Amino acid sequence: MVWKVLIADDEAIIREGIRESIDWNEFNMEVVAEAEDGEEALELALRHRVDVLFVDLSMPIMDGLTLMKYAREKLPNCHMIVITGYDEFSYAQEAIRLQVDDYLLKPTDPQRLREVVAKVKEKLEQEQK
């Protein structure tokens, strides 16, 4: 039942902050995977067939955009949360083509993440009636 979440950020302090700022279980979610590059992250999303994925836009090896293009193709209704820095926000517009459920600013605060994660659960809940 519990929806599988992948967290992919090029910085461990931000990655392990998302992972531990919310009780994912209250949103019927479990984090099945974190990733530190976009090659490992795509591999991990396909292997765990994730429902929900947080991706930083900036990734080494394979960048966040290229990962998200592969992911929307191969996991046609995962929900996608693009994580952006301040210096990089003007370039999240290139992701609208991919239908991303939300955009997350980095570094985040626990209440913003809860609003984000509550939207996704709502849409997930609807597709499963």
Listed in sequence order, the residues at least 6 apart from 38 whose beta carbon sits closer than 8 Å to its beta carbon are 8, 55, 59, 60, 61, 62, 63, 64, 66, 67
Q: How far is CA 50 from CA 69, 88, 107, in A?
A: 15, 26, 24
Q: Which technique? A: X-ray
For residue 31, the surrounding DSSP H or E stretch is strand 29-35
DSSP 67-110: HHHHHHHHSTT-EEEEEE-GGGGGGSGGGGGG--SEEEESS--H
- Residue 25 neighbours by CB under 8 Å, 6+ apart: 2
Domain that holds residue 40: 1-129
The structural domain count of the chain equals 1
Residue 34 and residue 14 in contact, taking contact as beta carbons nearer than 8 Å: no
Length of the chain: 129
- Integer CA distances (angstroms), 56 to 11, 68, 129, in order: 9, 10, 31
**CA nearest 127: which of 49, 73, 52?**
52
Q: In a 10 Å sphere around its CB, with 0-12 CB exposed, 13-18 middle and 19+ buried, how is residue 85 labelled?
A: middle
Terminus-to-terminus CA distance in the chain, angstroms?
A: 12
Distance of CA 14 to the CA centre of its chain: 12
User: Distance between CA 51 and CA 107 in Å, rounded?
Assistant: 23
Q: How far apart are CA 115 and CA 90, in angstroms?
A: 22
CA 93 to chain CA mean position, Å: 16
CA distance 42 to 30: 18
Please say whether the beta carbons of 52 and 24 come within 8 A.
no
Exposure pattern of 48-71 as b/e (b: 16+ CB <10 Å)? eebbbbbbbbbbeeebbbebbebb
- Give the span between the Cα atoms of 41 and 49, in whole angstroms: 12
